[PDB]
């Protein structure tokens, strides 16, 4: 019942590739980055999403009105 390791490929056949570190010359690609006010608006949207989905616990609804 069930298979064996002898009946299957190894953990070295899968995942056979060792590591090679790539490097690239700097032409100036990571310069002149725009959207300087992006994260401000992102944080604003996050806080807005949290506020609309906010619900304060109102135990006064359990007051003995009857």
């Amino acid at each position: 019942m069930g298979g064996k390791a002898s009946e299957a490929v190894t953990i070295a056949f899968r995942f056979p590739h060792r590591t090679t570190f790539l490097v690239k010359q700097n032409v100036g690609q990571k310069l002149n980055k725009g959207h300087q006010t992006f994260w401000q608006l992102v944080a604003g949207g996050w806080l807005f999403f949290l506020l609309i989905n906010r619900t304060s616990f109102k135990p006064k609804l359990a007051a003995p009105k009857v």
């Binding site: 590591t19 570190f21 790539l22 490097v23 690239k24 700097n26 032409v27």
Partner: protein, 486 residues
């Protein structure tokens, strides 16, 4: 106790903490502004199992040769980064609650747990030395021997399998590097470089528009010559591509790059044509770049470093050896993958290399003070504060580990460092007796870095030849002579 002593200055410490944060921000702004236009893109790479990133200094540790900065300012930058790391327990009340103040009390108890602001000293060197001598050397002196054992047992392996894993040519060098606390003799760094024989040959493939070409000493020499000639780019690129096609032909005659016939790496052949797509005898489909003539061979500006570290690579180290390597270097290690500790170690490596560059700009080691050199060696983890060495021994130690770190291999670096933290204690009071000989003295001349050393054969070690005994040594050592006599 120290808790109330530090609470007394906790009000006076917040202002200094914020000032230090501002200094850190300014310095990081400058450094990143330089890095984003002068440094290359070191791409992220995943380990053999392809689940976590792996890191090596050759690609990720960049040195800004030309950083307009004083060495002390860089020391401040690094020390304040470490202080930011040490400021982390302040988040405990903001995640646990008002009862998350007992961790803050434990933080304030020991001064070694704290950042610079809680220190009475002013100069960064004196502050660093105080922290080291109080907490850090003691913390490091209890990880060194165990780290050394882990590195040994990483090479030789577990469960009596040394005959299958160890090499018979690195044997005497292994013994001299790891068992010289038995003999009491000094060590040669080249015998630690011999540990790289466990690894394969480290190569560098430059990627072109046609094929990748292996970098060699000749091609690199030609490129340095062209860079020094300061020619026009119409001539510079032409000469570079001439050297590139020459090296391409040379390696094609050699039998291709070394990487084609190395387990774990390889260059694919031309793709196959399947079934009816096969046009008679042409069973292959060459790539597009085959259409390009070889005379148009141009370097893409892209490079591939292949260390071929089959036994030394930090991936195969393990969950424990990585943590101990970060402990021994007084870096953060807890509750993180080995990839993050790899990055931390590589960042420490980069810091040390940049500091070495700035020291060489500032006039070498001899321009430094005694406390400054002591602190540098403490950062390099080659000195413990219970030694009281001479200046020449310190200079030789710096030169040794600086050359060893120039090779960009953490394993041999740690193997070298851990040898300076093997101290014993005697059970008797009379023994060890008071010595009769003077203190150990050396010089920068006694360190042999400018010469190659073949691995001594097993059970046939050879004596050490001083560099001065070599022919024409007075000409080779003339720089060190001029630096020392002055």
């Amino acid at each position: 106790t120290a808790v109330v002593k530090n609470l007394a200055k906790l009000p006076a410490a917040t202002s200094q903490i914020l000032t230090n944060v501002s200094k850190l921000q300014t310095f990081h702004g400058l450094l990143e502004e330089r890095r984003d236009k002068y440094a290359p893109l070191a791409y992220h790479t995943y380990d053999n199992l392809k689940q976590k990133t792996t890191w090596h200094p050759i690609a990720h540790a960049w040195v800004d040769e030309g950083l307009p900065v004083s060495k002390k300012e860089y020391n401040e930058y690094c020390w304040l980064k470490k202080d930011m790391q040490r400021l982390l327990p302040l988040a405990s009340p903001f995640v646990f609650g008002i009862y998350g103040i007992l961790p803050l009390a434990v933080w304030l108890s020991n001064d070694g747990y704290l950042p610079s602001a809680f220190s009475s000293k002013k100069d960064i060197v004196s502050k660093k030395l105080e922290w080291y001598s109080s907490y850090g050397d003691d913390l490091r002196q209890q990880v060194g021997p165990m780290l050394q054992h882990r590195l040994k047992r990483h090479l030789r392996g577990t469960l009596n399998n040394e005959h299958r894993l160890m090499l018979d040519e690195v044997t005497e060098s292994y013994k001299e590097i790891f068992y010289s606390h038995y003999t009491g003799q000094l060590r040669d760094v080249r015998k630690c470089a011999h540990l790289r024989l466990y690894d394969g040959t480290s190569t560098v493939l430059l990627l072109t528009n046609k094929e990748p070409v292996e970098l060699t000493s000749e091609l690199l020499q030609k490129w340095n010559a062209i860079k020094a000639a300061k020619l026009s780019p119409e001539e510079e690129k032409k000469a570079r591509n001439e050297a590139l096609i020459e090296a391409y032909k040379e390696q094609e005659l050699h039998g291709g790059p070394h990487v084609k016939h190395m387990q774990g790496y390889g260059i694919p052949a031309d793709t196959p044509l399947l079934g009816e797509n096969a046009k008679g005898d042409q069973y292959t489909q060459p790539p597009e770049s085959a259409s390009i003539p070889l005379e148009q061979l141009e370097w893409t500006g892209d490079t591939v470093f292949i260390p071929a570290e089959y036994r030394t690579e930090m991936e195969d180290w393990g969950r424990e050896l990585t943590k101990l390597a970060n402990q021994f270097l007084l870096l953060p290690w807890r509750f993180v993958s080995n990839a993050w500790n790899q990055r931390r170690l590589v960042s420490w490596f980069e810091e040390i290399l940049q500091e070495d560059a700035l020291i060489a700009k500032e006039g070498g080691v001899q321009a430094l003070s005694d406390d400054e050199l002591k602190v540098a060696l403490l950062d390099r983890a080659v000195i413990r504060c219970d030694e009281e060495l001479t200046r020449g021994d310190m200079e030789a130690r710096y030169k040794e580990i600086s050359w060893l770190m120039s090779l960009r291999n953490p394993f041999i670096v740690l193997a070298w460092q851990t040898g300076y933290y093997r101290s014993t204690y005697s059970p008797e009071d009379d023994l060890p007796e008071a010595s009769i000989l003077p203190k150990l003295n050396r010089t920068v001349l006694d360190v042999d870095v400018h010469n190659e050393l073949a691995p001594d054969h097993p059970e046939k070690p050879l004596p050490r030849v001083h560099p001065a005994l070599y022919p024409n040594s007075h000409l080779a050592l003339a720089k060190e002579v001029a630096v020392l006599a002055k």
